[PDB]
Design a protein around this ligand. Structure first.
Ligand SMILES: [Mg+2]
Ligand SMILES: [Zn+2]
Ligand SMILES: [Zn+2]
Ligand SMILES: [Zn+2]
Ligand SMILES: [Zn+2]
Lengths: 34, 42, 44, 49, 528, 98, 257, 48, 115, 526, 67
RNA sequence: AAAGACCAGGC
């Protein structure tokens, strides 16, 4: 249930998920939406 | 940048303007008699 | 003078000192219909 | 930018992961203009009710 | 208001009287050209076509100037305007104008700038007078200014997006004055520090170092090829140092032909140990270091920045003082050309293999770093249990920081010495450092062994957070890793904390460079 | 109607919100364009985040030559509802005799 | 004071590659023959491009540049064709140029690949190396491309489009016996393809009396001129340049004396 | 300087104003030359 | 805008002579050959072919500036042997060498194809 | 903490801080706080388990995304003054497992250390092998790198649109460049780079480009410039109109050519236009007519790409014209690597002149080795080696800053597996004489980017041009044909020369000369 | 934008090898094997196909100025 | 278009 020696794949998978969800200008978009 | 003295551009500015209050005004002192060599009298 | 539209791309005839209005499209942006006179390009 | 105070311009330990350390303009605006890190997110605001 | 108009920079007095925008001035990017002379500047054809120099027609030059007028402004070697005696100005750009092409003595014809013209060349963070020197025009294709690389040092220029101004004197009086006062050869030696300012620099210097050794031997054809790039060569091929079994010349033998007249100078190579002058082989130099130039011939030694560079008593300084500016200009140019064309044979480079040491050296460096970490940990523990006595004049924190800094600096110096001791003679970093072209011993130390301690405001990396440098470290951790000592080298790659600390360290240099310049310029203006 | 507010591109209220790549291409808009900028008089304008001291918290600073030895200040704003900021200083009068 | 006798053997000869060894010759002549492979070999490539309609997403001179780099079969008629500068006629004539016509319009929805196949020449000898297909531009539905192009005769000095050859592999002294290059660590350097020494040893012993010979060549044609015609025309062109220099020198000597 | 056992000939200060008020103007000339030379040649540079 | 036309490394426009001979006054029986619009391809070729001649004492080529297209060849021979004759003999030597090489290459290609 | 992790009452944006020594607890819901996500550590094990990664691998068609990962209590948004009270682990596989005891109270672990870099600094391959000032230079320079800035550039008509012909995704790439969308819109192109001193034309920071490669389209780009124009009615009878002026109908007129204009005073696209050519025919009715037409900037020599007419806000006829000029890299253009190794093009040698390898490889760009030793770009050499090994292997090299699994030795062994020298050095033959170069040159494909700064847009020459209205001195700027400024430092430097009349010419004769008549009794002008 | 013919370093034709490379990548082969099957032995050629990005497909998504 | 401001950028 742990991720030993497979960390390089998992960290970049979660980073890819973050950037697909949010993007790069998410701060600007959220500020204007608020 | 344990005596610290301003060097470089600020020291050159201080010398050029002859600042009335230099940042690190220091005064070196020399000893005449036995105090020059012996540490206790120094 | 023939202008081609930016939305429907149907050429329309419009002279000067007339308002820009694309027929059958309702668009306000026109284009210049690249000229007929021919220029020579070197292959360098 | 005309200010000669070199302290605000310095890269702080407080900027780790928060602002890119390497990227900054050159000239009178070095350190005073900072671009966001990749993962940095700005709080948008919320009512504390 | 009127007072605002009459104010400092951009005001009337400073912005339109002490300094003002001028006609007959051109600016573009600069580009290296080793094939040009020291006093020569490459000028694009468009600039020379736009730029005009007024010339007065005499019976001596009436034919040539009439031909230039007939060419008009279309062909480059032509004239743009004709100025008559009454001052009316005639333009050759518009229509052929056949009635007005007549020329008689006393007229002024504004020909385009040609080869051999005299121009003032400027790059303007002008600190000293050598930042603006008179040059000789040579027209080249393409669109950039070109100038010799020894001239790089006086202008402080580097060929990356740099731009330089080109001022063309418009009168015979000022042209002669620039020729006899401000020419590049006439300003080789500075009055600031009584040293040469131009010097054999960078590529030509490294190739001189590699070419001056005993090891080099040149065959017949290579000798001929090198000899023709010597402008002051008398045409007599010197007898090779080795005659049998096959005729082989030596780098020193050919270089001695470059040295002008009969120059006498004694220098020392950067490698020169201090043991040689005391014991035997004082005049034999087993490493072939030191420099002896006798009767204008390089008898022995290795040339580097200590001999051909910009330093007091350098070989070029002796050449300027003993011979003169004109011959020293040719000395510079001949060195540049012949040495670059010999490097065309030998070649120079830098690579990954030049930035790595032997595995034994890596093990020794790691052992030294481990010993340093153990010693600093022991010092921290000793200070923790209060056995550290305060040095007089310093608080316990000051003495602890001094001890840690001494330990880390000693470790870095030892690792650097070990790394430099491991470099082979073929190593390119060592080849560049000993020649003095670029780099230093600490540079090799940082590349190979250890980057070293990173300092912010002259102190170890501070506690930006609450009694900790980064959140990854425990509070009140004064160890080398936590406070910014970078154990890894550039070749090995920095750890993320070390990377951030190095970024902080470089930010100091960036800020200093950006912020000191304004105050230095203000100081220079006040002094002037 | 009291006025028009410029709309940041690709925000919730922009016409490009929720459009797929094909829909954006049909609109002659780059699918890779992140948006986040305003179009004012045809030009593209981007607002740059401006740094400032955190409001409603207490800070203590020490000036080298001021008549105050230790100075405490609180840049205070009320829920950002109104007024820019009203800031208050609480300081200690150095050592020189009054 | 006379010519050494060079010998040539051809190791590999294909439709795209020729591998030959030149022996008993000087280093400079080998190098000049190598340089003429790239520079001085005549070839036919498109130079004059005129575009009637260009609806592609690539602008005019972009597709013109791509057309110019398209290799053209000039195995035979490159010799009979004269340079446009030396031709009597103004502009272009069939004795100085070859006309190419391109006419593509994309009507179907799927993208149309405008390839070298779509280039149409007036003479059957110059085909753009299509006895896959070199891609000029891609067209979506509704886009159109029509142009007329002339192909001239030139060599690599003028433009790289007139380079008749791919990478020309030149090599002499594979096992370093002349010590022209000094390996700081000879053991870590891979042995060349033409190396004649055993695997255990690294370099051949130094030869003080040796001079560069046995210059190994590998001429890879780009498909325009078949690889042996490249070297043959290279030798012919170098000899022609030498002969013209000889003629001018003789005229100068008679004039000055 | 007035203090006992302190060498009156070699004792000097880096600031210039008090040297002007104590030792004179030529002593200021010499001391200012020394200070400028120190601040220039500290890095190893040389100026004539 | 200052880029020279592509045809300036081989084309001779009006006025320039293809070759020029100027005697060298510094040493006896040495001449200077100036070849216009030409580069290392033949500069090295006559440089190396001259060194084969035992009667040539000095031989070489150089390019005064790469941005310009010119070659300066300096030839010094033994007395009673003009450098112009040596240069001509070297050119004819190279012509014969190239002709022989072309013939041998044609023979080799005929052997390799269906042989 | 539990409530924020499960996101019931407290949103993940809100920051909660416990200052233990000062007994204060600060909870911030304010806007403007800067925060970054961090993994959550319980005991010595991450809360990110195998199942989370398994579900994120199938993120497509799963409706399981970053938000569901945050809502699962695995990742947490930690701002700065809460980062003060947190203790972070660099990597889990190293700092979480039991070793020589340093810390056991780890509460959070970083996602990946390379996330501390920004958008421009993330494209640097092996940025931890570089000197930090050079990383700063490369970051500030990558904004000037030339490439396809946007996919719809054909429809956007903006001023100064630089577009490269053949951008390439780098041979050596960082894992973040995928999320930067740099692969789809590269700015630059990989090039076989030899680090050698060949002819001295690459000295200082300059580079030597391959003329044949440049002729093949290497680093060749396009330059779009847009020209807007506004017809308007300002006076009562004064009005503006687009039309082609005749030779004599207007009072004002310049000697520029007008024959290219159409009936509406607009040149259709596809017409070649050089310097001083009239772009838009525009006149003013003077209360006969005044010509206000706009000319090209001097010596651009481009081709009109697109001409669009429309109505502005006021409804007046509005015109924008875009003209493109393809610019081949000359010996004045600026080129830089991905490590701050900037420089101009020294000289362009053809393929014959450039040194070649035993395989016929000729470097497209040769950079002087003297740049490397001083400014500490070792990541340049490592990137070159990795590109050389990746072009052979067939993979795209991985240059994530902190890998600890990609050593220089590993890349060296991988390259040596492909028949090349393990250190990347290659024996080179002189292009001119054909002789082997005694030193072995370091050759490999390195990513290079062409910069906006180009000599054709920077060269200026002035010879008695326009003068200022007030000071009657040469104008300001390149575009206005203005003269160069002879500043105060310039005259001080000339005074050091003792060049009195050269200074007089520079400040009186070359600039504004004038004569005044002044009385002799009074010193005032008459 | 589009695959550049005539690999810059040497000049070998690679404008016709893009579609075949894409097919080989899409069906079985890895990039190294696909490049080897296309006869690209010099890494200067392999970098052209391997590092190429094809914006010509993205540019074709937008409707043409004229239908 | 004129000078004014602002901004970004090169050395
Ligand atoms: Mg510079
Ligand atoms: Zn329409
Ligand atoms: Zn013809
Ligand atoms: Zn009066
Ligand atoms: Zn290739």
């Amino acid at each position: 249930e742990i991720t030993p020696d497979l960390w390089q794949e998992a960290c970049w998978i979660v980073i890819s998920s973050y950037f697909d969800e949010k993007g790069l200008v998410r701060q600007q978009l959220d500020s204007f939406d608020e | 940048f344990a005596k610290n003295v301003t060097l470089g551009v600020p020291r050159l500015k201080e010398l050029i303007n002859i600042s009335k209050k230099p940042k690190t005004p220091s005064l070196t002192v020399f000893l005449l008699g036995q105090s020059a060599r012996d540490a206790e009298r120094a | 003078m023939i202008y081609i539209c930016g939305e429907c791309h149907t050429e329309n005839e419009i002279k000067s000192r007339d308002p820009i209005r694309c027929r059958e499209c309702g668009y306000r942006i026109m284009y210049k219909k690249r000229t007929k006179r021919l220029v020579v390009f070197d292959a360098r | 930018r005309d200010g000669k105070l070199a302290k605000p311009r310095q890269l702080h330990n407080t900027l780790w992961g928060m602002v890119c350390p390497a990227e900054t303009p050159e000239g009178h605006a070095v350190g005073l203009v900072k671009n966001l890190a990749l993962m940095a997110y700005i709080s948008v605001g919320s009512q504390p009710s | 208001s009127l007072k605002q108009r009459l104010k400092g920079k951009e005001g009337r007095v400073r912005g339109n009287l002490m300094g003002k925008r001028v006609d007959f001035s051109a600016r573009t990017v600069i580009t290296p050209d080793p094939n040009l002379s020291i006093d020569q500047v490459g000028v694009p054809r468009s600039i020379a076509a736009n730029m005009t120099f007024a010339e007065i027609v005499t019976p001596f030059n009436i034919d040539r100037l009439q031909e230039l007028v007939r060419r008009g402004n279309s062909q480059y070697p032509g004239a743009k305007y004709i100025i008559r005696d009454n001052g009316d100005r005639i333009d050759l750009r518009f229509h052929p104008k056949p009635s007005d092409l007549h020329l008689q003595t006393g007229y002024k014809v504004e020909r385009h700038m040609c080869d051999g013209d005299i121009v003032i060349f400027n790059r303007q963070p002008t600190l000293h007078k050598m930042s603006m020197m008179g040059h000789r025009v040579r027209i080249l294709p393409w669109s950039t200014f070109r100038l010799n690389l020894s001239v790089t040092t006086p202008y402080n220029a580097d060929f990356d997006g740099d731009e330089m101004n080109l001022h063309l004197p418009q009168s015979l009086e000022t042209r002669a004055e620039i020729q006899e006062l401000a020419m590049v050869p006439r300003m080789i030696v500075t009055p600031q520090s009584n040293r040469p300012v131009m010097g054999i620099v960078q590529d030509t210097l490294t190739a001189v170092r590699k070419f001056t050794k005993r090891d080099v031997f040149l065959e017949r054809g290579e000798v001929m090829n090198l000899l023709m790039f010597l402008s002051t060569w008398d045409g007599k091929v010197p007898q090779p140092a080795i005659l049998k079994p096959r005729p082989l010349w030596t780098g020193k033998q050919i270089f001695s032909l470059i040295i002008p007249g009969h120059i006498n100078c004694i220098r020392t190579h950067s490698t020169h140990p201090d043991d040689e002058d005391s014991g035997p082989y004082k005049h034999i130099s087993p490493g072939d270091t030191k420099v002896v130039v006798e009767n204008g011939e390089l008898i022995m030694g290795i040339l580097c920045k200590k001999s051909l560079g910009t330093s007091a008593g350098s070989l070029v300084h002796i050449s300027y003082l003993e011979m003169g500016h004109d011959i020293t200009r040719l000395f510079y140019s001949n060195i540049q050309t012949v040495i670059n064309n010999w490097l065309l044979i030998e070649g120079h480079t830098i690579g990954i293999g030049d930035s790595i040491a032997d595995s034994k050296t890596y093990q020794d460096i790691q052992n030294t770093i481990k010993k340093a970490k153990q010693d600093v940990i022991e010092v921290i523990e000793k200070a923790h249990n209060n056995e550290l006595e305060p040095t007089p004049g310093n608080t316990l924190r000051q003495t602890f920081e001094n001890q840690v800094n001494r330990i880390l600096n000693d470790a870095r110096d030892k690792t650097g010495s070990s790394a430099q001791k491991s470099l082979s003679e073929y190593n390119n970093f060592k080849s560049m450092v000993v020649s003095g072209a670029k780099g230093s011993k600490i540079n090799i130390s940082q590349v190979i062994a250890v980057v070293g301690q990173q300092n912010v405001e002259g102190k170890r990396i501070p506690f930006g957070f609450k009694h900790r440098t980064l959140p990854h470290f425990i509070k009140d951790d004064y160890g080398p890793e936590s406070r910014g000592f970078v154990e890894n080298s550039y070749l090995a790659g920095l750890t993320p904390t070390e990377f951030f600390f190095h970024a902080m360290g470089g930010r100091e240099g960036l800020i200093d460079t950006a912020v000191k310049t304004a105050e230095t310029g203000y100081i220079q203006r006040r002094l002037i | 109607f009291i006025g028009k507010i410029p709309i940041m591109l690709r925000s919730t209220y922009c016409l490009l919100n929720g459009l797929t790549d094909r829909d954006l291409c049909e609109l002659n808009e780059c699918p890779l364009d992140p948006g986040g900028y305003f179009i004012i008089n045809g030009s593209e304008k981007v607002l740059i985040a401006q740094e400032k001291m955190a409001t409603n918290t207490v800070y203590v600073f020490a000036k080298k030559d001021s008549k105050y030895a230790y100075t405490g200040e609180c840049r205070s704003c009320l829920e950002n509802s109104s007024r820019p900021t009203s800031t208050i200083w609480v300081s200690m009068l150095a050592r020189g005799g009054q | 004071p006379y010519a050494n006798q060079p010998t040539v053997r051809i190791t590999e000869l294909t439709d795209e590659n020729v591998k030959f060894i030149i022996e008993n010759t000087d280093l400079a002549v080998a190098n000049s023959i190598r340089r003429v492979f790239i520079a001085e070999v005549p070839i036919i490539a498109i130079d004059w491009v005129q575009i009637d309609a260009n609806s592609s997403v690539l602008h005019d001179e972009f597709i013109a540049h791509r057309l110019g780099l398209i290799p053209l079969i000039s195995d035979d008629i490159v010799d009979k064709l004269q340079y446009s500068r030396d031709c009597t006629c103004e502009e272009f004539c069939p004795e100085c140029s070859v006309e190419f016509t391109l006419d593509v319009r994309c009507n179907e929805d799927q993208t149309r690949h405008v390839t070298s196949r779509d280039l149409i020449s007036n003479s059957p000898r110059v085909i753009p190396v299509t006895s896959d297909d070199i891609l000029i531009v891609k067209l979506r539905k509704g886009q159109e491309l029509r142009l007329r192009a002339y192909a001239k005769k030139g060599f690599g000095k003028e433009h790289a489009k007139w380079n008749p050859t791919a990478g020309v592999a030149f090599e002499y002294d594979p096992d370093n016996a002349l010590r022209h290059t000094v390996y700081p660590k000879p053991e870590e350097w891979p042995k060349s393809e033409y190396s004649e020494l055993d695997e255990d040893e690294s370099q051949a012993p130094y030869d003080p009396n040796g001079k560069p010979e046995r210059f190994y060549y590998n001429v890879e044609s780009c498909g325009s001129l078949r690889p042996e015609t490249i070297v043959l025309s290279a030798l012919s062109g170098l000899k022609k340049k030498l002969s013209d220099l000889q003629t001018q020198l003789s005229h100068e000597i008679q004039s000055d004396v | 300087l007035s203090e006992k056992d302190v060498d009156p000939v070699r004792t000097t200060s880096n600031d210039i104003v008090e040297i002007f008020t104590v030792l004179g103007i030529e002593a200021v000339r010499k001391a200012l030359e020394r200070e400028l030379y120190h601040v220039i040649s500290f890095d190893g540079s040389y100026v004539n | 805008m200052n880029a020279p036309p592509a045809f300036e490394s081989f084309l001779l426009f009006e006025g320039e002579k293809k070759i020029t001979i100027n005697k060298d006054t510094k040493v006896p029986n040495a001449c200077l050959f100036t070849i216009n619009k030409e580069d290392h391809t033949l500069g090295n070729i006559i440089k190396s072919q001259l060194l084969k001649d035992p009667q040539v004492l000095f031989a070489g080529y150089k390019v005064p500036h790469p941005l310009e297209h010119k070659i300066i060849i300096r030839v010094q021979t033994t007395p009673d042997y003009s450098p112009q004759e040596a240069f001509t003999n070297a050119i004819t030597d190279l012509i014969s060498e190239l002709s022989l090489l072309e013939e041998r290459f044609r023979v080799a290609i005929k052997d390799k194809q269906e042989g | 903490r539990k409530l924020r992790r499960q996101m019931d009452i407290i949103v993940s944006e809100v920051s909660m801080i416990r200052d233990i020594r000062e007994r204060e607890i600060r909870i911030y819901t304010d806007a403007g706080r800067i925060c970054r996500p961090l993994l959550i550590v319980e005991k010595q094990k991450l809360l990110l388990k195998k199942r989370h990664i398994d579900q994120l691998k199938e993120r497509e068609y799963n409706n399981y995304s970053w938000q569901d990962l945050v809502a699962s209590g695995v990742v947490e948004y930690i701002d700065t003054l809460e980062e003060e009270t947190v203790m972070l682990a660099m990597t889990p596989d190293d700092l979480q497992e039991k070793e020589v005891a340093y810390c056991s109270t780890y509460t959070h672990c970083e996602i990946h250390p390379s996330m501390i870099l920004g958008v421009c600094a993330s494209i640097i391959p092996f940025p931890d092998h570089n000197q930090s000032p050079r990383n700063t230079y490369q970051s500030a320079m990558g904004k000037q790198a030339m490439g396809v800035y946007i996919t719809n550039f054909h429809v956007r008509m903006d001023t100064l649109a630089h577009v490269l012909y053949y951008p390439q995704k780098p041979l050596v790439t960082t894992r973040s460049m995928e999320y930067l969308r740099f692969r789809e819109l590269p700015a630059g192109i990989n090039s076989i780079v030899a680090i050698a001193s060949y002819t001295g034309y690459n000295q200082e920071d300059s580079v030597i480009m391959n003329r044949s490669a440049v002729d093949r389209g290497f680093f060749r780009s396009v330059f779009y410039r847009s020209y807007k124009e506004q017809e308007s009615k300002k006076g009562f009878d004064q009005e503006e109109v687009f039309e082609k002026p005749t030779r004599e109908t207007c009072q004002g007129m310049r000697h520029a050519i007008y024959d290219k204009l159409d009936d509406d005073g607009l040149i259709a696209p596809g017409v070649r236009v050089s310097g001083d050519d009239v772009i838009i025919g525009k006149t003013v009715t003077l209360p006969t007519k005044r010509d206000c037409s706009t000319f090209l900037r001097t010596s651009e020599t481009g081709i009109v790409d697109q001409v669009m007419v429309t109505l502005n806000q006021e409804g007046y006829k509005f015109c924008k014209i875009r003209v493109r000029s393809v610019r081949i890299p000359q010996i004045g253009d600026k080129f830089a690597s991905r490590h701050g190794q900037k420089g101009t093009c020294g000289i362009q040698y053809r393929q014959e002149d450039m040194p070649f390898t035993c395989e016929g490889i000729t470097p497209d760009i040769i950079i002087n080795p003297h740049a490397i030793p001083s400014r500490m770009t070792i990541g340049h050499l490592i990137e070159c080696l990795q590109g050389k090994v990746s072009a052979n292997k067939g993979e795209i090299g991985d240059a994530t800053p902190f890998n600890d699994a990609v050593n220089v030795q590993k890349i060296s062994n991988l390259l040596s597996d492909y028949g090349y020298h393990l250190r990347g050095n290659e024996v080179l033959y002189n292009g001119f004489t054909g002789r082997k170069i005694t030193s072995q040159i370091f050759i490999g494909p390195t990513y290079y980017q062409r910069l906006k700064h180009m000599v054709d847009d920077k060269i200026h020459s002035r010879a008695r041009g326009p003068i200022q209205i007030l000071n009657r001195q040469p104008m300001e700027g390149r575009s206005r044909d203005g003269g160069l400024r002879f500043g105060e430092m310039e005259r001080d430097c000339q005074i050091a020369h003792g060049a009195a009349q050269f200074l007089r010419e520079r400040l009186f004769e070359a600039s504004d000369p004038y004569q005044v008549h002044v009385c002799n009794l009074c010193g005032i002008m008459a | 934008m589009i695959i550049p013919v005539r690999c810059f370093t040497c000049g070998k034709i690679v404008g016709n090898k893009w579609e075949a490379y894409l097919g080989l990548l899409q069906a079985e082969y890895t990039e190294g094997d696909a490049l080897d099957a296309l006869g690209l032995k010099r890494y200067c050629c392999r970098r052209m196909l391997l590092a190429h990005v094809d914006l010509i497909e993205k540019l074709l998504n937008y409707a043409p100025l004229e239908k």
